[PDB]
Design a protein around this ligand. Structure first.
Ligand SMILES: [Mg+2]
Ligand SMILES: [Mg+2]
Ligand SMILES: [Mg+2]
Ligand SMILES: [Mg+2]
Ligand SMILES: [Mg+2]
Ligand SMILES: [Mg+2]
Ligand SMILES: [Mg+2]
Ligand SMILES: [Mg+2]
Ligand SMILES: [Mg+2]
Ligand SMILES: [Mg+2]
Ligand SMILES: [Mg+2]
Ligand SMILES: [Mg+2]
Ligand SMILES: [Mg+2]
Ligand SMILES: [Mg+2]
Ligand SMILES: [Mg+2]
Ligand SMILES: [Mg+2]
Ligand SMILES: [Mg+2]
Ligand SMILES: [Mg+2]
Ligand SMILES: [Mg+2]
Ligand SMILES: [Mg+2]
Ligand SMILES: [Mg+2]
Ligand SMILES: [Mg+2]
Ligand SMILES: [Mg+2]
Ligand SMILES: [Mg+2]
Ligand SMILES: [Mg+2]
Ligand SMILES: [Mg+2]
Ligand SMILES: [Mg+2]
Ligand SMILES: [Mg+2]
Ligand SMILES: [Mg+2]
Ligand SMILES: [Mg+2]
Ligand SMILES: [Mg+2]
Ligand SMILES: [Mg+2]
Ligand SMILES: [Mg+2]
Ligand SMILES: [Mg+2]
Ligand SMILES: [Mg+2]
Ligand SMILES: [Mg+2]
Ligand SMILES: [Mg+2]
Ligand SMILES: [Mg+2]
Ligand SMILES: [Mg+2]
Lengths: 47, 48, 95, 55, 118
RNA sequence: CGAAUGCCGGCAUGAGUAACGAUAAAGAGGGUGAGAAUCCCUCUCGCCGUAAGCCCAAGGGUUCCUACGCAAUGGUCGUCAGCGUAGGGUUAGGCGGGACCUAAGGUGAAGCCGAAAGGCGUAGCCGAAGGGCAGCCGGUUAAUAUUCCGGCCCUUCCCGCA
């Protein structure tokens, strides 16, 4: 039956994207934290 | 519903359960021409 | 500098590569950023030939593993080029 | 026996023998309602020990 | 119970277990000896003996009969012309079942031999 | 440390038990191989057929092709594989999208408002499974083909001539 992940590569780059995060102070701080924790990927990988 | 065992069964009691589990060796007869062994009323692997 | 010898990496060695020698068509590994236009001159300048048609295609490298060490081989592009009719590349004629 | 310890094949019997239990490889068996048990494919160390009949 | 009920179902319904004996027969009347499981063998037995006996009767009817099962003109010719003749002075027992001494693996099943007689 | 339905690990019991995932269905002969119900070929049988066939878009990301393999993965087996190793393979002025258009909405010189962060907003800009725009049919490879080749057409830009 229809489940929760319906992958779409545009939605992903538009929603969790890098330019996404950077537009909003909420989201610059997302990147700041991820960068500080030393995440390898700051942001979802969509192809 | 959903019945369950009440006690881990003991090393004594599971082994005794198995008293019948032992195998019995194959039934074997000497072959009509070749030297070898065969189950009775079958066709010999050698010299059928 | 960028000179022609940068645009052209190596010849591609395969049945399918060779099989085109017999028509005007010679295929190399080229630098991935290099456009159809400039690949032409780079091959003209290097092998002193006339180039008439270019075909490019990217070859995205294979993922391989050394055992818990998992990565991928680097990415490519290849060009198959058409020399003017009758011209050849004697450099590439050793089969 | 014959080939190493010079034992004379024709009189060989099985003196003693046994299988101890090796290290078990575990795998996941997915189940109803999300559940996932683990089943263990096991391992045996088989040992046959030969000696010479006395006849 | 079963109680003087006789004849095997082997884990097949009516359709498929018919089609089985027909197919087994087609293969015995072709190769003259065959290898199956002991029970599939023992049930073949009579299924061909009748098919054979009808070739021994030889007439257009008995042929049209045998075509119901074997379905194939060529295989039937082999039956009427070249097989039944070896049997014409023989009363029944046109086949023989001997069991093989080794059994399948991953199966465990005992196998036997089914060959036409002599 | 003996208990906290404690925490982490390891190993038991139930048990050689339940199951082994659509009741569309199998049989034989032959081949290969240390080893075959399970791989390959032939024959017969059965099941789909507005599909259980074939194309396209998502999404997936080498799974494609071929050689050598069977520890593990495969609910058994495996000599087989979507599995291990390795090599190869995706070719476009016209197909799709961009050096075109605008839609919702987004964003935004001007302007306006808000402790700060920010919120708004004309025109513009961005934005498409809409509008616009020139390639048909065969043949070719183990593996690509309106892409390579064959035949027969067409578009735009630049320069020249009338
Ligand atoms: Mg629906
Ligand atoms: Mg989930
Ligand atoms: Mg999309
Ligand atoms: Mg890194
Ligand atoms: Mg430099
Ligand atoms: Mg291209
Ligand atoms: Mg289950
Ligand atoms: Mg689930
Ligand atoms: Mg347990
Ligand atoms: Mg009953
Ligand atoms: Mg059954
Ligand atoms: Mg029926
Ligand atoms: Mg206490
Ligand atoms: Mg019980
Ligand atoms: Mg039971
Ligand atoms: Mg059961
Ligand atoms: Mg089933
Ligand atoms: Mg052989
Ligand atoms: Mg062999
Ligand atoms: Mg129809
Ligand atoms: Mg895709
Ligand atoms: Mg996946
Ligand atoms: Mg892989
Ligand atoms: Mg394959
Ligand atoms: Mg192979
Ligand atoms: Mg394996
Ligand atoms: Mg296995
Ligand atoms: Mg592979
Ligand atoms: Mg644009
Ligand atoms: Mg331009
Ligand atoms: Mg626009
Ligand atoms: Mg705004
Ligand atoms: Mg607006
Ligand atoms: Mg569009
Ligand atoms: Mg359109
Ligand atoms: Mg177009
Ligand atoms: Mg294909
Ligand atoms: Mg075509
Ligand atoms: Mg063409």
């Amino acid at each position: 039956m229809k489940r929760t992940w319906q992958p779409n590569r545009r939605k992903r780059a538009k929603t969790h994207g890098f330019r996404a995060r950077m537009r909003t102070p909420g989201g610059r701080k997302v990147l700041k934290r991820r960068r500080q924790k030393g995440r390898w990927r700051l942001t979802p990988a969509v192809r | 519903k959903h019945p369950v065992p009440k006690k881990k069964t003991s090393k004594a009691r599971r082994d005794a359960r198995r008293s019948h589990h032992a195998l019995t060796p194959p039934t074997l007869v000497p072959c009509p021409e070749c030297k070898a062994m065969k189950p009775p009323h079958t066709v010999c692997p050698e010299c059928g | 500098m960028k000179t022609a010898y940068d645009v052209i990496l190596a010849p591609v060695l395969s049945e399918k590569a060779y099989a085109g020698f017999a028509e005007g068509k010679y295929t190399f590994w080229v630098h991935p950023k290099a456009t159809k236009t400039e690949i032409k001159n780079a091959v003209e300048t290097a092998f002193k030939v006339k180039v008439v048609k270019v075909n490019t295609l990217h070859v995205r490298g294979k993922k391989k593993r050394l055992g818990r060490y998992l990565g991928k081989r680097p990415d490519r592009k290849k060009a198959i080029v058409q020399v003017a009719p009758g011209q050849k590349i004697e450099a590439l004629e050793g089969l | 026996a014959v080939n190493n310890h010079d034992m004379l094949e024709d009189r060989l019997y099985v003196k003693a023998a046994y299988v101890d239990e090796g290290p078990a490889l575990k795998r996941v068996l997915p189940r109803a309602r999300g559940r996932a048990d683990i089943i263990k494919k096991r391992t045996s160390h088989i040992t046959v020990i030969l000696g010479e009949k006395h006849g | 119970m079963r109680h003087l009920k006789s004849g095997r179902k082997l884990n097949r319904h009516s359709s498929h277990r018919l089609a089985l004996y027909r197919n087994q027969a087609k293969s015995l009347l072709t190769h003259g000896r065959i290898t199956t499981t002991v029970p599939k063998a023992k049930e073949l037995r009579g299924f061909v003996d009748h098919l054979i006996h009808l070739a021994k009767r030889g007439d257009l009817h008995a042929r049209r009969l045998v075509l119901r099962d074997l379905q194939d003109v060529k295989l039937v010719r082999k039956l009427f012309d070249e097989i039944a003749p070896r049997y014409r002075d023989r009363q029944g027992g046109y086949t023989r079942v001997l069991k093989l001494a080794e059994r399948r693996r991953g199966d465990g099943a005992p196998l036997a031999l089914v060959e036409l007689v002599e």
